[PDB]
Amino acid sequence: HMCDAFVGTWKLVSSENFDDYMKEVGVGFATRKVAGMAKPNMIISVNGDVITIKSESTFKNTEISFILGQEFDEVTADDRKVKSTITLDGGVLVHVQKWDGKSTTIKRKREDDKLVVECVMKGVTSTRVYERA
Ligand SMILES: Cc1nnc(-c2ccccc2)nc1O
Numbered sequence: 001h002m003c004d005a006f007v008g009t010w011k012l013v014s015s016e017n018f019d020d021y022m023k024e025v026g027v028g029f030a031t032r033k034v035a036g037m038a039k040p041n042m043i044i045s046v047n048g049d050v051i052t053i054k055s056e057s058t059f060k061n062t063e064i065s066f067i068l069g070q071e072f073d074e075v076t077a078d079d080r081k082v083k084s085t086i087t088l089d090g091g092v093l094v095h096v097q098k099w100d101g102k103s104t105t106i107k108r109k110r111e112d113d114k115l116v117v118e119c120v121m122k123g124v125t126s127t128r129v130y131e132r133a
Pocket residue numbers: 035036038040055057059060077106117128
């Protein structure tokens with residue numbers, strides 16, 4: 001029942017500061033513009049110890065599967081090759097991506113009927129709110 005309240009299909013309903021987050025990460029202009037337009041669905045499922053998170057959008061369809069605490073290699077939607085570790089901290093899924101001596105953290109939390117995503121790169125935070133599809 002690890003992650004039960006995250007499981008399901010979620011749709012993006014608001015975003016704040018995502019262009020600035022992507023700038024801080026190093027995403028180039030054209031990718032920022034097209035990716036910033038995307039309205040992804042986030043599909044989260046669990047099978048035993050394996051969690052799968054799919055993001056489907058007009059921009060890209062991606063999928064990661066992982067075990068909490070166990071590092072994996074990830075190719076991000078903007079084509080970074082990162083080393084990722086996802087843990088559960090006090091009911092929050094915390095996803096750290098490391099590449100080129102840089103690091104960013106993506107937190108996913110349940111708040112009321114929403115799934116709130118906070119993306120942080122240095123001093124820049126973007127907040128993305130998802131609702132059940
Ligand atoms: C957590 C999360 N991960 N990926 C995206 C995404 C995917 C494709 C294009 C733009 C953004 N948005 C998020 O909110």
